[PDB]
Structures are given as structure tokens and as C-alpha cells.
Design a protein around this ligand. Structure first.
Ligand code: SF4
Length: 54
């Protein structure tokens, strides 16, 4: 498999960015398996990669 981004290289933060959050993101796969970053991932999160899904 191709290597995943670290919580560094995805730009993870300890608080969400307004309305942009992991627990509402198109990438997250509940309960916790984001396709953008290494596992686990918090309910709040946000990453430095954009998505067109609000
Ligand atoms: S780290 Fe980013 S891509 Fe992954 S679930 Fe969170 S907001 Fe989505």
C-alpha cells in the first residue's frame, strides 16, 4: 500500500476549523479511519487538505 500522511504532514490540529471537522468530513470512515492521515483520528481534527463536501 502507498504510505499515509503523518499527523504532522496532514497538518492535524487539537481544535476544528469553524464548520470543517473530521467527525463531519467525507474522508473520515466512522468510528475513526481517515483516508488522508494515519490512525487513529479524533472526532474534531481538521487537516491542511480541502474537501468540496461541506
Ligand atoms: S483529517 Fe481531514 S481528510 Fe481526514 S477526516 Fe479529518 S478533515 Fe477529513
Amino acid at each position: 500500500v502507498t504510505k499515509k500522511a503523518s499527523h504532522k504532514d496532514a497538518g492535524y490540529q487539537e481544535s476544528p476549523n469553524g464548520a470543517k471537522r473530521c467527525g463531519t468530513c467525507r474522508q473520515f470512515r466512522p468510528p475513526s479511519s481517515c483516508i488522508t492521515v494515519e490512525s487513529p483520528i479524533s472526532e474534531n481534527g481538521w487537516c491542511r487538505l480541502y474537501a468540496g463536501k461541506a
